[PDB]
Scaffold this active site. Structure first.
Site, PDB file in Angstrom:
ATOM      1  N   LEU A   1     -13.454  64.958  43.289  1.00  0.00           N
ATOM      2  CA  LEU A   1     -13.776  64.446  41.960  1.00  0.00           C
ATOM      3  C   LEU A   1     -15.241  64.690  41.641  1.00  0.00           C
ATOM      4  O   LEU A   1     -15.776  64.087  40.721  1.00  0.00           O
ATOM      5  CB  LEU A   1     -13.438  62.959  41.866  1.00  0.00           C
ATOM      6  CG  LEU A   1     -11.976  62.646  42.200  1.00  0.00           C
ATOM      7  CD1 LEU A   1     -11.675  61.161  42.027  1.00  0.00           C
ATOM      8  CD2 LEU A   1     -11.045  63.503  41.354  1.00  0.00           C
TER       9      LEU A   1
ATOM     10  N   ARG B   1     -15.733  51.737  31.724  1.00  0.00           N
ATOM     11  CA  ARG B   1     -15.917  52.876  32.689  1.00  0.00           C
ATOM     12  C   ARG B   1     -15.851  52.441  34.124  1.00  0.00           C
ATOM     13  O   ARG B   1     -15.441  53.243  34.953  1.00  0.00           O
ATOM     14  CB  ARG B   1     -17.225  53.653  32.493  1.00  0.00           C
ATOM     15  CG  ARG B   1     -18.517  52.874  32.712  1.00  0.00           C
ATOM     16  CD  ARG B   1     -19.795  53.702  32.455  1.00  0.00           C
ATOM     17  NE  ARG B   1     -20.957  52.801  32.299  1.00  0.00           N
ATOM     18  CZ  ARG B   1     -21.347  52.247  31.150  1.00  0.00           C
ATOM     19  NH1 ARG B   1     -20.749  52.546  30.021  1.00  0.00           N
ATOM     20  NH2 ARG B   1     -22.358  51.418  31.116  1.00  0.00           N
ATOM     21  N   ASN B   2     -16.232  51.174  34.410  1.00  0.00           N
ATOM     22  CA  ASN B   2     -16.224  50.664  35.769  1.00  0.00           C
ATOM     23  C   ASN B   2     -15.100  49.699  35.971  1.00  0.00           C
ATOM     24  O   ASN B   2     -15.149  48.845  36.875  1.00  0.00           O
ATOM     25  CB  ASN B   2     -17.604  50.073  36.176  1.00  0.00           C
ATOM     26  CG  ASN B   2     -18.674  51.147  36.357  1.00  0.00           C
ATOM     27  OD1 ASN B   2     -18.417  52.199  36.910  1.00  0.00           O
ATOM     28  ND2 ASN B   2     -19.844  50.911  35.821  1.00  0.00           N
TER      29      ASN B   2
ATOM     30  N   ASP C   1     -23.528  46.675  36.071  1.00  0.00           N
ATOM     31  CA  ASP C   1     -23.055  47.643  35.067  1.00  0.00           C
ATOM     32  C   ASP C   1     -21.596  47.462  34.746  1.00  0.00           C
ATOM     33  O   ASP C   1     -20.797  48.439  34.753  1.00  0.00           O
ATOM     34  CB  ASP C   1     -23.320  49.074  35.537  1.00  0.00           C
ATOM     35  CG  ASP C   1     -23.139  50.103  34.420  1.00  0.00           C
ATOM     36  OD1 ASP C   1     -23.159  49.768  33.230  1.00  0.00           O
ATOM     37  OD2 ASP C   1     -22.912  51.246  34.748  1.00  0.00           O
TER      38      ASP C   1
ATOM     39  N   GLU D   1     -19.502  65.006  42.146  1.00  0.00           N
ATOM     40  CA  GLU D   1     -20.683  64.458  42.805  1.00  0.00           C
ATOM     41  C   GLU D   1     -21.250  63.195  42.097  1.00  0.00           C
ATOM     42  O   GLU D   1     -21.405  63.167  40.875  1.00  0.00           O
ATOM     43  CB  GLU D   1     -21.697  65.600  42.879  1.00  0.00           C
ATOM     44  CG  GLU D   1     -23.044  65.288  43.485  1.00  0.00           C
ATOM     45  CD  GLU D   1     -24.104  66.266  43.023  1.00  0.00           C
ATOM     46  OE1 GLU D   1     -24.807  65.927  42.035  1.00  0.00           O
ATOM     47  OE2 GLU D   1     -24.205  67.358  43.639  1.00  0.00           O
TER      48      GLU D   1
ATOM     49  N   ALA E   1      -6.691  54.252  42.110  1.00  0.00           N
ATOM     50  CA  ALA E   1      -6.137  53.630  40.871  1.00  0.00           C
ATOM     51  C   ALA E   1      -5.639  54.802  40.069  1.00  0.00           C
ATOM     52  O   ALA E   1      -6.437  55.596  39.664  1.00  0.00           O
ATOM     53  CB  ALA E   1      -7.239  52.872  40.130  1.00  0.00           C
TER      54      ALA E   1
ATOM     55  N   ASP F   1     -17.199  49.819  41.734  1.00  0.00           N
ATOM     56  CA  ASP F   1     -18.614  50.124  41.814  1.00  0.00           C
ATOM     57  C   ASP F   1     -19.421  48.848  41.808  1.00  0.00           C
ATOM     58  O   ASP F   1     -20.536  48.792  41.279  1.00  0.00           O
ATOM     59  CB  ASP F   1     -18.960  51.014  40.607  1.00  0.00           C
ATOM     60  CG  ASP F   1     -19.632  52.217  40.996  1.00  0.00           C
ATOM     61  OD1 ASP F   1     -20.823  52.088  41.306  1.00  0.00           O
ATOM     62  OD2 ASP F   1     -18.934  53.266  41.023  1.00  0.00           O
TER      63      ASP F   1
END
Ligand SMILES: */C=C\C(=O)Nc1ccccc1Nc1cc(N(CCCN2CCN(C)CC2)C(=O)Nc2c(Cl)c(OC)cc(OC)c2Cl)ncn1
Length: 288
Positions: free
Chosen positions: A23, A150-151, A146, A25, A99, A164
């Site tokens: 996926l 997105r997380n 954060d 870096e 996921a 994360d």
């Protein structure tokens, strides 16, 4: 790197891990999909984090710290859990839950109206599950810093899992102008005390959760589109608050605004958000 002590209850023999597609870096590591046999004759899809080819000694230290922090936080249904590591006879692999439906921003965007549509109950239920995740993390004294769609990642069975979350505080030189792969500025999710005074707490994650609610109810909308960093600081100093999304009740909008209290002590806690979202889910229609 090839001189790491084993932690036996977490150790998976390397030959039980079938590596797959990269996926690409990250900041200090990189992630590849894989399959893990055992965890006896059963394969589980996992995601694996390992070092870049050109990797510092601090990268290695950071990858270890994230692993060890995952161990200390422990398991919860609404987080991406550590499943294993390969520390012996080769490169360090940190193996986590995989996921399959991508991140929540993507999940939501893919289910915008003209297959798979989300009912209003489904949307409140994503919020609930994230809140539950964050309540668990808060109870383990983990400040995310954060929190954003997105997380959050979505499993094959539509479970939300915070991602994360195991990163130690950067000895803060955070770059305000750095964008995400998708072109958005993470400063747009940060509480003002975080942005202006560099203070991050559970309270500041609750501010971020309010932006996340707004992302949920805009089906992956982008906050403050076209607003650069300097103009964002001015909006925040003025006490600007984003408009109510369409297809969001007044009650859910008040929850957002409460998450976005200027005074950190006055925001709800994740414990309170979980309770409210629990009640709201039960009352929210799945008929559209
Ligand atoms: C299970 C099927 C599958 O293939 N799922 C999948 C395909 C494609 C993309 C994502 C996923 N699902 C997934 C991913 C992860 N990742 C990678 C998330 C995307 N990357 C972010 C970093 N960027 C540098 C590349 C894109 C993930 O990072 N998981 C993860 C790891 Cl490896 C970790 O290691 C210590 C710690 C955490 O969180 C604490 C996470 Cl989230 N993870 C699960 N499913």
């Amino acid at each position: 790197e090839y001189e790491l002590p084993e932690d036996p209850r977490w150790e998976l023999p390397r030959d039980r891990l079938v590596l797959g597609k990269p996926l690409g870096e990250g900041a200090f590591g990189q992630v590849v999909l894989a399959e893990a046999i055992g965890l006896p004759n059963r394969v589980t899809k996992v995601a694996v984090k390992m070092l870049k080819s050109d990797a510092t000694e601090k990268d290695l230290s950071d990858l270890i710290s994230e692993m060890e922090m995952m161990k200390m936080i422990g398991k919860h249904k609404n987080i991406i859990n550590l499943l294993g590591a390969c520390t012996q006879d080769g490169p360090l692999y940190v193996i986590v839950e995989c996921a399959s439906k991508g991140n929540l921003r993507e999940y939501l965007q893919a289910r915008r109206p003209p297959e798979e549509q989300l009912s209003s109950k489904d949307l409140v239920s994503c919020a609930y599950q994230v809140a539950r995740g964050m309540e668990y993390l808060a109870s383990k004294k983990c400040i995310h810093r954060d929190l954003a769609a997105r997380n959050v990642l979505v499993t094959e069975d539509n479970v939300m899992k915070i991602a994360d979350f195991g990163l130690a505080r950067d000895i803060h030189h955070i770059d305000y102008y750095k964008k995400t792969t998708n072109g958005r500025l993470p400063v747009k999710w940060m509480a003002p005390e975080a942005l202006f005074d560099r203070i991050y707490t559970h309270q500041s994650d609750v501010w971020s959760f309010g932006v996340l609610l707004w992302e949920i109810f805009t089906l992956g909308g982008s906050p403050y589109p076209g607003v650069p960093v300097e103009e964002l600081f001015k909006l925040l100093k003025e006490g600007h608050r984003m408009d109510k999304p369409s297809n969001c009740t007044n009650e859910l909008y008040m929850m957002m605004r409460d998450c976005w209290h200027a005074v950190p002590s006055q925001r709800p806690t994740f414990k309170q958000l979980v309770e409210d979202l629990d009640r709201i889910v039960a009352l929210t229609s799945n008929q559209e």
